[PDB]
């Protein structure tokens with residue numbers, strides 16, 4: 311209530327957000343990279359994506375679900 | 389706004405999970421497909437992922453919920469605002485920027501840490517001028533199409 315111990319408390323009310331904030335960015339970037347990363351720019355993935363395009367779509371569906379969980383846990387720190 | 393065929397693409401992906409063909413994706417089927425790809429999610433992680441799209445409450449994902457999720461991705465208004473709020477957590481100036489080094493430092497040291505090649509692909513996807521500051525907002529505009 312009195313002075314500084316809030317400024318060192320407001321640091322900690324906010325510090326518990328930095329891990330869920332990073333998780334949200336990392337989950338969002340990994341979702342965005344699903345359709346642009348060099349990891350999929352190989353002959354193996356092009357052929358794999360030709361015979362079975364469902365595999366890459368399944369990987370995207372999993373990453374979307376992980377992004378949604380991460381976005382929630384970050385919102386629960388507000 | 390979805391073509392009849394890109395709906396059939398999502399139906400093909402849905403059917404990979406829904407092996408028994410009963411129209412629902414349980415934690416069993418979701419985790420089985422995840423672990424055939426080499427991932428190891430906990431049972432609680434499977435429930436949290438399913439609960440994000442389970443609009444009925446029976447603990448399963450049906451096809452209408454599935455294609456809605458697949459069509460939305462991160463393009464919704466709530467995602468754009470929350471992802472940026474996560475970037476602002478590491479923004480001391482309040483400028484809308486963050487130094488390319490601190491972004492690299494945050495991505496490789498907090499949460500599900502990115503590999504050296506992952507964060508290098510992220511920094512390459514953003515553009516940097518002058519001091520070394522990324523405009524992380526036009527970055528979340530790029531991620532959220």
Ligand SMILES: [Ca+2]
Pocket residue numbers: 405406407408409410411412413414417
């Ligand atoms: Ca089923």
